[PDB]
Amino acid sequence: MDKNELVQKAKLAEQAERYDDMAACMKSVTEQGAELSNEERNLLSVAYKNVVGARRSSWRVVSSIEQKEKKQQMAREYREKIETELRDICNDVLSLLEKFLIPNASQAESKVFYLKMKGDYYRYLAEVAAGDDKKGIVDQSQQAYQEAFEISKKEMQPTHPIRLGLALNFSVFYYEILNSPEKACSLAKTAFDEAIAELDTLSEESYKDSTLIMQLLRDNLTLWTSDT
């Protein structure tokens, strides 16, 4: 099909909850090589998140079954198969990002969005990376998020949804991958507080997304500051 047609089909697939088809359409839009609109960025992002997310959820379950003598090899073998599927999806997205999206992202909002995504998919690899928990691929994740963070503080207001979403996931990366609760809380708190001081600067089109991410930051803060 042609580009506008691939996007329409992607939205249809989303409504039908056929996330493989959705990602295949957005992948083909991407490989055409033209910069994506805001709408096409969101569609690509939601499609891959659901596709990779099903492997992540499955891997948790099988990972855990497996760690809780005779049978057990089976659970291990199944976990590895799921892992390969996971790694393949993350490498697919990382390659699209490195070959088409980052290189020609000509606007700051796009670069931040793509560098955050690069962050996310290295983080998903790090959750499963050889050792069963975390290899020097964590450095690729950190680098991408760090550059996205600096660009977003320089070019975007504190209530922009993309700057907020990036702070949220960078916060999660500090907590879960780097194992630093204080750096995660500090990053999330500063993002929430800077946004709440400027609610004034929120637009009609982004107010719902901005405010939803703000609560997500607050829930992580409660969660990471909880008591047993």
């Binding site: 979403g165 949220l168 907590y175 997500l216 992580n220 969660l223």
Partner: peptide, 8 residues
């Protein structure tokens, strides 16, 4: 509980 991230 799982930490929250965005998109979910």
């Amino acid at each position: 509980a799982r930490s929250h991230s965005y998109p979910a």
